[PDB]
Amino acid sequence: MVKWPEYIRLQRQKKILRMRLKVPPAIAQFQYTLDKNLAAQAFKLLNKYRPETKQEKKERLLREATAIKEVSKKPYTVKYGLNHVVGLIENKKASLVLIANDVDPIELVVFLPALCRKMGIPYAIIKGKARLGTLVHKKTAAVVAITEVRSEDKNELAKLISAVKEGYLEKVEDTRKRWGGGIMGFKAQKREEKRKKSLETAIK
Amino acid sequence: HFRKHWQRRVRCHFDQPGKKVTRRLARRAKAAALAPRPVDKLRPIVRCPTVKYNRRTRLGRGFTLEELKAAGIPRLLAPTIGIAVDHRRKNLSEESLAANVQRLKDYKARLILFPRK
Amino acid sequence: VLEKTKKRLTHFPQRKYAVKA
Amino acid sequence: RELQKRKRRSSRPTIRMPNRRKKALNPAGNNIIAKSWNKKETLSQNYTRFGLVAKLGKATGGTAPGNKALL
Amino acid sequence: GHKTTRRVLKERPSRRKGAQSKRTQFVRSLIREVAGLAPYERRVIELLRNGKDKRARKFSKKKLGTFGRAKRKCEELQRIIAESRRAH
Amino acid sequence: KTHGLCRRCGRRSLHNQKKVCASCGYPAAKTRKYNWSEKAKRRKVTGTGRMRYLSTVPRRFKNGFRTGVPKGAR
Amino acid sequence: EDGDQLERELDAMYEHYKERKASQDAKYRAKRARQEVDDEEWEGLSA
Amino acid sequence: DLASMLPHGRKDAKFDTKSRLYELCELAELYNCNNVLFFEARKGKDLYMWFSKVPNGPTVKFYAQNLHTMEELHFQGNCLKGSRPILSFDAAFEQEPYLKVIKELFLHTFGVPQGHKKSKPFIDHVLSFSVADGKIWVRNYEIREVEKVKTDINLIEIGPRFVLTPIIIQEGSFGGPILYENKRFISP
Amino acid sequence: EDPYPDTVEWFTSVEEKMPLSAAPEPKRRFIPSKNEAKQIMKLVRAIREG
Amino acid sequence: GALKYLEELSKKKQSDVVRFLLRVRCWEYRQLNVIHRASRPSRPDKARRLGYKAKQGYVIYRVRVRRGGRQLKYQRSLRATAEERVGRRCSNLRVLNSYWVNQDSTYKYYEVILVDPNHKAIRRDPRINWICNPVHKHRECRGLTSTGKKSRGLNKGHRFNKTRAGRRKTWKRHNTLSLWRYR
RNA sequence: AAGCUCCUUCGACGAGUCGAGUAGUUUGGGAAUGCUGCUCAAAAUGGGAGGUAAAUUUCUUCUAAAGCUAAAUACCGGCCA
RNA sequence: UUGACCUCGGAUCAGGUAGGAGGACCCGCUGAACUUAAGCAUAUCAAUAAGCGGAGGAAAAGAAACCAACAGGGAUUGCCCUAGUAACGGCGAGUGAAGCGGCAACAGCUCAAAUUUGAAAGCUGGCUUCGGCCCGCGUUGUAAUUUGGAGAGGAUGCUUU
Ligand SMILES: [Zn+2]
């Protein structure tokens, strides 16, 4: 019949392999992600603590330069960068951690849920490294973390932490220690009975 | 003992005087570059390793950090004022430490230092 | 040249000296 | 060999190379060493006349009777 | 030999090259937990749980190549068993 | 005849069937050369031809590859 | 949701690749023409 | 050669020099062996043989030199692989008290037990230990039988030829108090 | 045997209450930004020079 | 800290996670070309410690190399062959250094870090302007990479007498007859 | 911006790499002299190499698997003399 | 419906770069035979010649996972002796180093491993009135600080641009 291009065929075969292969727990827990409402609430507190764009930073710097031509509180923002966030987690300065589910290579993040659990910091897995990326002003963020917030948002951050902790970490504790994968469909199972009825009947 | 091709690997030193003149002119050129300064850096006195040669001293590579401190010469300034520094050598003996500090003090006494610019 | 090398050359530059006879 | 023969046979001029040296052989400038340096004297001779030491190392041979520059 | 006055030298960090980094130890333990075990380590774990400890040690030798390495691997896996038991 | 005019080297050395020059090997980018024939190497070494540009290089090196015109010219 | 249609399409494409790469020899074609099919593929009707 | 002559033995590869002489004992426990014959080479030039009964005592150290192993084409003799040998010892081995401790261990090492299932059923060789200098000389001989003239035993050397000089006997597997010191050992 | 066994948390089951690093905090984490001060000074010099 | 976490995870290779990832990638690389470009290092910690930066001028190439021997054994490794092939492909770049990524049973896989010497950022930045210098053309061909040094035995000690400071140079120095003017 | 000094504070160092088995090749060099391929495959008061009969494997000396660097050295070819 | 991210492509898109020659010396891959000696065989020729790949004015090597057993040395390179010694060889034909010591020259350094986190402070372009405008790269990490005979952070007082 028709012939697909090589890269399209390769990526669809990668889909089939990801759905078919039995996945180790450290990647199955990445397959488990959170939901629409919790993601939306996260990005509401977070969008208030988004970094300053480059134009805004230049405009601010020009403002103080002009002021000196013719005394501030500590800025609070969403902390991003893999090494920086890992350092914050290790030093227990992070209050919340959000990890993108689709970082390839995966090894960059595959230990992050375990590190967060060991250090006791609430963590969650978000669908979309491009979305964590849009909070910061970059194309992709593998991880973002909330360290401290303003007094106007302390209660909101605490309630978000409680909600994410319960409604995601309890389900993840129920199913994170087990293997993933094994979503064999009709064709896969039929091939399985074909293989067994061709193998164990008479000969090997 | 000529089983190999010594004829294609033979070397004749007809350029011995020419190389000597070249070396002497090289020592003259570095003296022209480093005019008031000597054309060599100060070297410490060390003991030869082997028991065959252990009763005679020679010139080592560079001065050690603790003897440099004892003589009172800063580490970052010693290569600047023309003293070789060796971070690998260790004293292990008050005799060598004292002899090298005496040498550095003699250099201190005989040295002329120009005040920057 | 690197900034660290520039700092080192700025604060410890090769001095002129003579050794007496 | 063929290149040199072609050079000798052709009318293109020979490119005589000036005796350029990478390093200057004598002190220059308007300082004491340059204004007291004798270009016809040797290194040890000049440093003996100046009163300065030219080598802090061990002597590798016998010096002139009046040499005082090889400590 | 000759009589020279002995001197005591300062501590060498290159001599301190031996790793006592508690943070490196933490990283190693967490990575062990995250990654899991090789098939031969799983076999050694099964043998150690069943009590074949001399067999485990022999198989560890056959897979690694040295008595000391086999001993260290067996000790590491026994500590993993103990930690799993006290965690369960 | 098994050897025609090679365009790269100019000799009557082009096997018509193989289409490869026996002297320089025209289809190959490299010019055929073997260390067991010093005579052939010295027949086709540099200096046996016209030397259009390599002959003019040394004067520019002697004057320092400078660009411009002498002051007060034209 | 389980990628069933995609799995069937990819399997069919790989099988077609196999048959053409095998039938570009004509000895495989002769063997296919001569060899007889089995009955454990027709099984299911009554037996 | 020694391992081939020993059927109740297990050959074991390089031992770490930074390891422990009693880690030798745990290794022997690992392999369920009650005797240890350890080869320790110094500078790649000199041999040292530690004979031991593990775990509790006693243990001797020999300096081993003057080696002439097998596959040296001047012996002309052979024997079955694993057959029980005849152990020949010396009157000095029975007289000196330390030579008596070394005889017992060499019996326990080269014993080749009677009912062992890897040993050969027939006897054809003799392993002889002799004391001439302050050293122990070991020889291995085939017993060839020749019909008498109107059978008689003849001996042809078959195997390794090495010289051992005793250094220490320790009470304990690879440690404990020193019971004997050569005090005349000239180290290479 | 179990080919794909569940992980037993023998290390993450215990929670540590202290940071890994005992290194002291620098002054810069408490004082305003010196780099931003340099940038503002460069901008002020540029505005002075027009 | 992610770099040490990755270093330990790479140390533990037959662990389940690394084995699974290596299997899937080995499949993906077999589906891909023999030599192809990478985007991002699959081993960022190894690339960084070997000298990879995320600058305009650094590129990765993954190369497949057939494993085995010629009973003759090739004195150059499969790692050096991969570097030489990647250089012949990208003749305009300098091969900085290569590292292992997958092995299967028929081919070994290597990611080669290469640097563009003609890029303005590379030329202006020190620490790499040395590779901008012309003496470093085809280090992989002259054996000047880490694999080349290892194969040449460029180590100091009594175990490397015949190979350090150049094997052929040492042989020539030992086989020259030196005759002086006064003999 | 930089150097030193002090300390009731810290101190991170290179993995299919070592190493074991094996085949080839190479060296004066089975403690395999080095290298390559192949199967297995590491450690953290660690690892490498030496010393030593001295009584246990004590002592001595360095940090591999990342990188740059002039000079003294070679030169039957290039510009000349 | 729309818009990002990732991957893979197109362009006679803008700017660059590689080929070939030379190869005396230099760095690698591959690699003989004639000859000599020995019952025979390994060996020797030779880790050479031929073939292939890659640079420069020098190349390479190079700042100890070194040498040593010292009362210690202290990156690399080359000359002298070491020395026809040690070692390996039917202890044949033979092959054949190195430490020390005297000398020539001497020069030291850069990264990965830590969070700038009170502010990506870094850099490629192309539009310029040459003064600064945007596009982008980049957090899966570009600057500064640090590189284990170290260092960092605080404190403290002098000294340098
Ligand atoms: Zn032609």
From TrEMBL, chain A:
Protein name: 60S ribosomal protein L8
Keyword annotations: Ribonucleoprotein, Ribosomal protein
Cellular-component GO terms for this entry: cytosolic large ribosomal subunit
Family: Belongs to the eukaryotic ribosomal protein eL8 family.
Domain Ribosomal protein eL8/eL30/eS12/Gadd45: 70-157
Signal peptide range in chain numbering: none
Function: Component of the ribosome.
Included stretch of the parent chain: 52 to 261 of 262
Automatic annotation (TrEMBL), chain B:
Domain of life: Eukaryota
GO terms (BP aspect): translation
Swiss-Prot/TrEMBL keywords: Ribonucleoprotein, Ribosomal protein
Single GO MF descriptor: structural constituent of ribosome
GO cellular component, one term: cytosolic large ribosomal subunit
Family, as annotated: Belongs to the eukaryotic ribosomal protein eL13 family.
Protein name in the entry: 60S ribosomal protein L13
Organism from which the protein derives: Chaetomium thermophilum (strain DSM 1495 / CBS 144.50 / IMI 039719) (Thermochaetoides thermophila)
Organism lineage string: Eukaryota, Fungi, Dikarya, Ascomycota, Pezizomycotina
From TrEMBL, chain D:
Classification lineage: Eukaryota, Fungi, Dikarya, Ascomycota, Pezizomycotina
Subunit field text: Component of the pre-66S ribosomal particle.
Cellular location(s): Nucleus, Nucleolus
Source organism (scientific name): Chaetomium thermophilum (strain DSM 1495 / CBS 144.50 / IMI 039719)
Function: Involved in the biogenesis of the 60S ribosomal subunit.
Region Disordered: start-end pairs: 1-22
Protein name listed in UniProt: Nucleolar protein 16
Family of this protein: Belongs to the NOP16 family.
Biased composition (Basic residues): 1-11
From TrEMBL, chain G:
TM ranges: none
Biased amino acid composition, Basic and acidic residues: 5-36
Subcellular location: Nucleus, Nucleolus
Family listed: Belongs to the class I-like SAM-binding methyltransferase superfamily. RNA methyltransferase RlmE family. SPB1 subfamily.
Protein name: Uncharacterized protein
Organism: Chaetomium thermophilum (strain DSM 1495 / CBS 144.50 / IMI 039719)
Covered residues, full protein: 463 to 509 of 834
